[PDB]
């Protein structure tokens, strides 16, 4: 299954959900790349919540 993530969708996720942007700042420049971070987030319980 494939889902399309536009850049504007990423910005809307950051604006509507500051918790995701907080997880974006301390992980993506540090440990893993941005698509890996989003694939981890979409399979996490945080996305379901």
């Amino acid at each position: 299954v494939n889902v399309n993530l536009s850049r504007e969708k990423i910005l809307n996720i950051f604006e509507n959900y500051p918790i995701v942007k907080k997880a974006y700042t301390d992980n993506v420049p540090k440990n893993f790349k941005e698509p890996e971070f989003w694939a981890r987030f979409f399979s996490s319980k945080l996305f379901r919540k």
């Binding site: 893993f32 698509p35 890996e36 694939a39 981890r40 399979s43």
Partner: protein
Amino acid sequence: LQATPASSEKMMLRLIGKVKPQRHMFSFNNRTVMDNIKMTLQQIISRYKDADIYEEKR
């Protein structure tokens, strides 16, 4: 990742690397362990392949 089906007798997981390609053998005893390890490792190689594709496009 080459995986064995549940109908087969021996459970073993084959790993294929990239640049001669490196090949590794991972045999297991229990079928639930194979299921969990293959879904976790398939998810992480899917994430890494998506990251590599995004880096190659950029």
